Amino acid sequence: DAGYVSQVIGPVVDVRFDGELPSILSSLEVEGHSVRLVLEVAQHMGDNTVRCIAMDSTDGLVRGQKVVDTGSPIKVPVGRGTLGRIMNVIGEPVDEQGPIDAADIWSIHREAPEFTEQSTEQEILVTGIKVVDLLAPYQRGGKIGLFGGAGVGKTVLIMELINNVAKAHGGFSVFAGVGERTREGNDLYREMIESGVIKLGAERGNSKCTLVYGQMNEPPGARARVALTGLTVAEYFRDIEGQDVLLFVDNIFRFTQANSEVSALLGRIPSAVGYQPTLATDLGGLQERITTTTKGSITSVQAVYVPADDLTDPAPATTFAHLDATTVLSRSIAELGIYPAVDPLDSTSRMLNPNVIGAEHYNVARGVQKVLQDYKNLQDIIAILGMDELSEEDKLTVARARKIQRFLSQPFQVAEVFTGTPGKYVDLADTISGFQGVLTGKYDDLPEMAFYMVGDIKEVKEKADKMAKDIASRKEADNKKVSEELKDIPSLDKLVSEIKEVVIEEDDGLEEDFKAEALSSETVVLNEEGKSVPLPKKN
Amino acid sequence: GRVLSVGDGIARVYGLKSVQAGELVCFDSGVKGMALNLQADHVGVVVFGNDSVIHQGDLVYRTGQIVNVPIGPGTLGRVTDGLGQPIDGKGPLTNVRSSLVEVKAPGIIARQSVREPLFTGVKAVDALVPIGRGQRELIIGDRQTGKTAVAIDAIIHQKNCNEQVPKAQRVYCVYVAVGQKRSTVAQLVKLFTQTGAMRYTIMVSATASDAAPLQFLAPYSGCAMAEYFRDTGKHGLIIYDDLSKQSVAYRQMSLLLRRPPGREAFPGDVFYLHSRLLERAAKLSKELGGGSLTAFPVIETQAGDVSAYIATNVISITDGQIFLETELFYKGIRPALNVGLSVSRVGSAAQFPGMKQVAGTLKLELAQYREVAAFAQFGSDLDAATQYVLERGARLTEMLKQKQFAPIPIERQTVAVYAATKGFLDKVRVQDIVAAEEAVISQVNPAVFKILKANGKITPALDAHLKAELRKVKLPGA
Amino acid sequence: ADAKALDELRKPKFSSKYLIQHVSQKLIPAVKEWEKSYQPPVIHLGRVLSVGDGIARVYGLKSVQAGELVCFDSGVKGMALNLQADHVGVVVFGNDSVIHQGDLVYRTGQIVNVPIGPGTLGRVTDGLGQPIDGKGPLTNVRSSLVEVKAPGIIARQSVREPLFTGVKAVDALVPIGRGQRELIIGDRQTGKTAVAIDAIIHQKNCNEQVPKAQRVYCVYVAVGQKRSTVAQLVKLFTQTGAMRYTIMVSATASDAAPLQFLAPYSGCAMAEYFRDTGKHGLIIYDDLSKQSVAYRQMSLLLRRPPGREAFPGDVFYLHSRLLERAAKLSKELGGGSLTAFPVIETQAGDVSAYIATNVISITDGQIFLETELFYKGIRPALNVGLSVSRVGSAAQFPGMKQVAGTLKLELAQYREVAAFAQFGSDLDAATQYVLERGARLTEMLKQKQFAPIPIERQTVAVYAATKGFLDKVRVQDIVAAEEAVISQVNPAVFKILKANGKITPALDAHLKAELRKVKLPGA
Ligand SMILES: Nc1ncnc2c1ncn2[C@@H]1O[C@H](COP(=O)(O)OP(=O)(O)OP(=O)(O)O)[C@@H](O)[C@H]1O
Ligand SMILES: Nc1ncnc2c1ncn2[C@@H]1O[C@H](COP(=O)(O)OP(=O)(O)OP(=O)(O)O)[C@@H](O)[C@H]1O
Ligand SMILES: Nc1ncnc2c1ncn2[C@@H]1O[C@H](COP(=O)(O)OP(=O)(O)O)[C@@H](O)[C@H]1O
Ligand SMILES: [Mg+2]
Ligand SMILES: [Mg+2]
């Protein structure tokens, strides 16, 4: 019928069974624990023993405790009521609003959608970031990748992409938090209640998003399957409902790391540099479930933390085959102070072809690639020469190229809480010819930084007008200034007579609810009969 | 055989007193399997599919046969999985025959020296780093750089060549997709249908979504499909794409099966499992069938390291390298074929003699250009025996640019590179580029292309017309 | 040879019993002739099979859990990290020399608990609750769960409180928060202890001003620091008075591994109490790489599989829940805070080091301290172009926040033109002036070790280089001109800006006049 935990090694525990062993990728439950604990079996030991992975911390499992079989894979409650809910890996409410108002639980482990039901019709997903929509154009229902180091600006692109595409769609979306910080988790909960994507009250059914959160605090059972828990509710809305759902998964690398933290612990030799031996079927099984079929559409948005901007590690080097549109973030362009710091060379999508979009889109983005590759091949030699002997034919594809690295920049709506400048929702054909102009020489007349953090071709000519005036401004130093006391300025002590009286009490309020109990001077132990005794005094 | 321990797509079975090494077994729940290693007490069995169906104590039946794939002409146009089943949704594969995927390569006396050339449409491949019918050439590169593009534009060129070439010497395509997405192959099944190449192509696509040994077996079965076109005497093109993922396949099973790890945790014999693949495609001699087989493996590097362990093997067993760098790809030379890094072993020994007297200088003039390539970012001029060569190199960049999915016929790219090195070049400025590239290939009469494909070489009864035809380059857009 | 053959072996098929009648008669005199050589059968207790070096392997113990404190028979405390099939691997707190093959192991049943509360303010324990400061046991304290998971998503709010460090190199250049996880990653001997101790002495001399609801108490966790350095910092905390509002858990390098492994964990167990009861808490996890080496010692004796640099698999999860339990709660649980300082020493410049890539991805902002910048006069040697934060505005002083954009972006161009000094250009009055500006900005932003200067003096001190008042002053003597800018101005204007908090035009008129009233000694 049921079995017992026989062995605990950190975050993997071993359950023995007396006949009819559970199928692989089923769910187990322990009774008498603090929280409900789900064990997901990964391999059979051989001696009537499954080997598990732990959805929460194992600190507390006694050897021999009762383990029941649910006989079935992990079931999350899918449904239309799940919108506006912050969801766990194992189906829990962690936003503390009752149970999940949904039915028809579904197995979150399945096979990939087959080869026959594959979509090849491609639609350009216009986002609103001038480096995305020109250079690496995303695909509707396709894949969106995001690499970059820890501190280059990956996650602030993701919520910016939510404000771009997940608001102006009307349908449903899903934010799949896989092992990121709670800070960028909790802040996104506030900036979707205020932006109205997630609602509270009796309007829970008209919302647009579910949040599946497997953040960094959980042990790697939960950080390894929150990718699948966020995935299957997106694949539930695809096949049953037909709506296009946007999957915003964060830190796909943390999905592959959470596998790799216990993959050695299940009895496997480490692979290349120390990552997991089975990363191919782990990630390849993850990715090809995220597609768009004949029945519906899933537009995957993937953020990946890469360690120290090195793309030779095999845990992101399997991901490059698995992403059509890739927005590779360079720390160098952020060290230039340019946001978004999207690489003009490393970030290249699959929509970029004149056989689909049109020659007017493909030629300027290729024209961007000529002027920016040669700018990289010349900024090595500009430090030996200083750009003074080039005979005025290589001083044209440089001066525009120093401008075009600023013309990838844009103030963000989600970032204006800490940058001050208001964000732009930029369209496509207005800036393609705008990108085309500064490549051609129509805007050679302008200075350097007028291109920085702007939008259309109207705002670049109007940053120079303000900039040109500001070189005519601050041309005075004499008198009639703020520094005199004649106009409105009080004396220095009459500021001080409006200060509010701040009380200091020196005892700080620390003995009001703290139950200042006593602790034992001698360590308390148990006896063989189990009752509490002090230590029997003998070595 | 009963299963003791099963996990991660690896089932360790007990029993099976007569199972063979590499024998294809079958489980209870319809999923097949192969036993790779056979130990004293338990036998290790790798699993071709999902592994969450087998409990402990299930049963395995031996089929008594080493793993085989259905080979033959009925596979043409179908999209199969690597084990030998179709996934296209077009029902079964009829007019086929099953044959063993594991045999030995052709020996010494089976071989004949590769002399006649394969033509692959990309002029940067055909003229600079050429490829013979029955030859091994590695499309190495970065990712997002066009290794699939050099593969598929060769395939579309064969369909652009097979319609005007007789029945025997028609080059059939088996592009084997290893580790690509299940949605990328959907684009590739579209491009072979829309162009019409699906009369000639067999798309073996073991994805990233299936289990480990399917990605391991997809090159052997795909080369076993290439075995059928060899001993029938036809000519065949076999392409493995992203063979590094097949190395990720042979890594993933070896460490799961507790075989001893070697360099970068790959097994030691992974060089042998790459060689018996790539030594299977060759040119059989005129006593044993006369057919050929040319293999185009693909290795995806990381940042251009050609000394990584997996690339170290394939460069050693194959002949040359078509190095496709990502950085110079945005420098407009399409494909980014680093001629100083990309060599083929045969050189001019196996090239069509309409190119031989002009590729025999083209690797010499590009040698003069790459030795002087640091000067193009300098305005201060040298003696103009350098700077004319810098423009002889510059109009030999855009001389080699190839539009995507558009292979050009073989005798057209012969006279086009004849129109740059001989000196009928675009001396006027690069404001007008669009009528300086296409003018040679469109404004001459099409009698001259008919002659060059018949005789094999620019005879001296043609150069006076050919110098005259390039002289009246029209360019009506000036 | 299967288990059904084993269950068939449970059915007796002996067909004769011509031994069992007699071997049952000579069994009991045999076991009672050799009775002295029998240790008793032990079920809910434990007894040691193998012991060594901090990992002791104990037979039995059917009652224990993972993470239960056990007590050996000599009084030594222990911890059950993994539980194998027949035995339980027990990690040993302290020296392990007293344990033999055959000694008793007593289960205490509880999860490991170190005493928490405000009575510990002024005490230095180790990671186990035992006092080393020579002031006896802890009074008015209580035990708490050190293995507790972090506060959830519904429990947190957006951070607002800036957490002034008292350092102009920090508060102007890297915005810190009160619930922000700030990493100090550098080389060895480069000022990492300098930046952390500058924050606490500032937070003590700004603790006797703020009214009960921004009072940031500090716990400084010493992992592997030698015991003279522990007496050094106790001497530093006492001789300014900071020890009144300072707890310090101090795991030396001459202690065992798991006392160093638990000391940041017990270090945050104190500071969760300051977060739970509404106050603000400072925590510094000093030498957090050396705590991870203290993790690597235990596992590699524990027959556990190694990975990158022979560190185990789950070492990301170690530093994750060590730095996720520091937070800023919502209004519904007091509104308390915790702000985090982990210290990671690079292996002389490996940012791709295995511990580094974990802790740079967990934490919110990082502060690079190269050994390059430490000898160019820049002390503390903060890297500006490589240091990022998250929350930006509403994480600095708000009057500083407007002038910080004038400070950061001019520093952004200056780091690009500083390496272009190989030609002697100084062209068009801009390639010299941004060199003239940013060099004085570097000579602005140096300070002294152990000199906590409040932000209100720094919002004036940041104004001296952003405006004029320094456009005629050399690159040699700004470090003795800044103090005369501090001294000769009216000492009442600093209080009213910290009272205001923002640069109003009502106060902007005074701040332009008073910096020409001062006369600079750089000449
Ligand atoms: N001649 C060309 N002109 C413009 N773009 C091209 C050309 N050739 C290839 N590309 C670009 O290459 C991209 C993908 O081609 P391909 O799949 O061959 O590259 P790849 O190196 O195989 O990439 P991956 O290895 O990631 O699959 C497309 O986005 C396409 O825009
Ligand atoms: N801001 C500073 N100004 C002047 N000297 C400093 C400064 N910071 C550090 N030092 C010098 O550096 C030495 C070490 O200081 P500190 O312990 O802060 O560095 P650390 O990198 O934390 O050292 P460790 O790596 O050993 O912990 C001190 O002896 C002091 O002389
Ligand atoms: N467009 C932008 N505007 C303002 N700040 C930006 C922009 N892009 C990136 N940043 C900065 O980059 C920093 C890192 O952001 P985040 O996405 O959290 O990085 P990571 O994904 O590496 O953790 C943020 O603090 C943010 O302020
Ligand atoms: Mg490819
Ligand atoms: Mg120190």
XYZ file of C-alpha atoms in Angstrom, chain B residues 16-179:
164
model
C 18.983 -11.843 -20.756
C 21.462 -14.709 -20.937
C 21.837 -14.113 -24.685
C 21.562 -10.471 -25.588
C 24.098 -9.013 -27.976
C 26.216 -5.894 -27.704
C 24.114 -3.062 -29.069
C 21.076 -5.285 -29.525
C 17.752 -3.491 -29.832
C 15.421 -4.707 -27.081
C 11.780 -3.895 -26.427
C 10.117 -3.077 -23.123
C 6.572 -3.896 -22.040
C 5.011 -0.486 -22.666
C 5.857 -0.212 -26.369
C 9.070 1.781 -25.916
C 12.173 0.206 -27.448
C 15.683 0.081 -26.037
C 19.273 -0.805 -26.791
C 21.677 -2.551 -24.448
C 25.011 -0.754 -24.798
C 27.095 -2.193 -21.986
C 26.599 -5.696 -20.665
C 28.053 -6.382 -17.249
C 28.444 -9.496 -15.119
C 25.201 -9.396 -13.143
C 23.040 -6.632 -14.620
C 22.843 -5.440 -18.218
C 22.694 -1.722 -18.946
C 19.970 -0.704 -21.394
C 19.521 2.782 -22.847
C 15.967 3.868 -23.686
C 14.668 5.388 -26.934
C 11.937 7.540 -25.499
C 10.166 8.611 -22.350
C 11.320 6.716 -19.302
C 8.464 7.385 -16.854
C 6.549 4.275 -17.982
C 8.817 1.530 -16.598
C 8.543 0.449 -12.960
C 10.908 -1.913 -11.154
C 10.074 -5.497 -12.006
C 8.875 -4.882 -15.547
C 9.979 -7.079 -18.424
C 12.141 -6.619 -21.528
C 11.956 -8.809 -24.636
C 14.951 -9.314 -26.897
C 14.295 -8.859 -30.591
C 17.492 -10.690 -31.524
C 18.580 -7.969 -33.953
C 21.074 -5.122 -33.793
C 19.313 -1.779 -34.217
C 18.213 -1.166 -37.789
C 16.483 1.586 -39.740
C 14.276 1.267 -42.855
C 16.388 2.445 -45.805
C 15.239 3.016 -49.363
C 13.591 5.413 -51.799
C 10.184 5.558 -50.100
C 11.742 7.673 -47.344
C 12.187 10.578 -49.786
C 10.158 13.526 -48.591
C 9.341 11.939 -45.243
C 10.364 13.273 -41.849
C 11.303 10.313 -39.671
C 12.718 9.980 -36.199
C 16.204 8.561 -35.866
C 15.095 5.101 -34.787
C 13.191 4.523 -38.034
C 9.626 5.650 -37.425
C 7.886 8.538 -39.225
C 6.763 11.632 -37.335
C 5.439 13.607 -40.314
C 1.883 12.336 -39.947
C 2.003 10.771 -43.427
C 1.478 7.186 -42.290
C 4.166 4.524 -42.615
C 7.213 4.337 -44.875
C 6.505 1.983 -47.780
C 8.932 0.779 -50.512
C 11.704 0.677 -47.902
C 13.959 -2.001 -46.487
C 15.418 -2.295 -43.006
C 19.187 -2.590 -42.726
C 21.708 -2.605 -39.910
C 22.913 0.827 -38.820
C 26.225 -0.553 -37.516
C 28.630 -1.812 -40.181
C 32.245 -1.092 -40.998
C 33.470 1.657 -43.303
C 34.652 0.959 -46.866
C 38.203 -0.372 -46.933
C 41.165 0.566 -49.086
C 40.308 -1.247 -52.309
C 36.724 -0.022 -52.116
C 38.026 3.529 -52.532
C 38.745 5.466 -55.686
C 40.355 8.903 -55.552
C 37.794 11.714 -55.570
C 38.188 13.616 -58.821
C 34.813 14.904 -60.004
C 33.509 17.837 -57.940
C 30.371 18.434 -55.927
C 28.868 21.873 -56.453
C 27.184 23.533 -53.485
C 25.848 26.840 -54.758
C 27.627 29.094 -52.281
C 30.432 30.485 -54.434
C 32.567 31.069 -51.347
C 32.452 27.311 -50.807
C 32.829 26.213 -54.417
C 35.707 28.438 -55.551
C 37.713 29.139 -52.394
C 37.445 25.982 -50.251
C 36.111 23.430 -52.729
C 34.369 20.130 -52.073
C 34.486 16.969 -54.161
C 31.823 14.336 -54.706
C 32.623 11.800 -51.997
C 34.509 14.039 -49.603
C 34.437 15.095 -45.956
C 34.235 18.805 -45.179
C 33.462 20.332 -41.791
C 31.120 23.317 -41.523
C 32.490 24.594 -38.237
C 31.350 27.883 -36.785
C 29.732 29.810 -33.980
C 25.975 29.830 -33.385
C 23.574 32.217 -35.198
C 26.218 32.412 -37.938
C 24.897 30.395 -40.871
C 26.132 26.809 -40.565
C 22.616 25.617 -41.337
C 22.582 28.168 -44.164
C 25.685 26.717 -45.834
C 24.007 23.334 -45.465
C 20.577 24.198 -46.870
C 21.818 26.425 -49.695
C 23.816 23.440 -50.866
C 20.595 21.390 -50.759
C 18.619 23.942 -52.776
C 21.492 24.046 -55.274
C 21.168 20.303 -55.828
C 17.495 20.756 -56.683
C 18.668 23.589 -58.917
C 21.153 21.141 -60.459
C 19.242 17.844 -60.498
C 16.559 19.037 -62.908
C 19.117 19.496 -65.723
C 21.428 16.540 -65.014
C 20.818 12.872 -66.022
C 19.466 10.088 -63.826
C 22.723 8.641 -62.513
C 24.648 11.644 -61.217
C 21.841 13.216 -59.188
C 22.841 14.227 -55.675
C 20.267 13.193 -53.081
C 20.034 14.997 -49.763
C 19.732 13.587 -46.272
C 20.060 16.570 -43.956
C 20.159 14.975 -40.522
C 18.840 17.307 -37.847
C 20.418 16.617 -34.460
C 19.552 18.826 -31.527
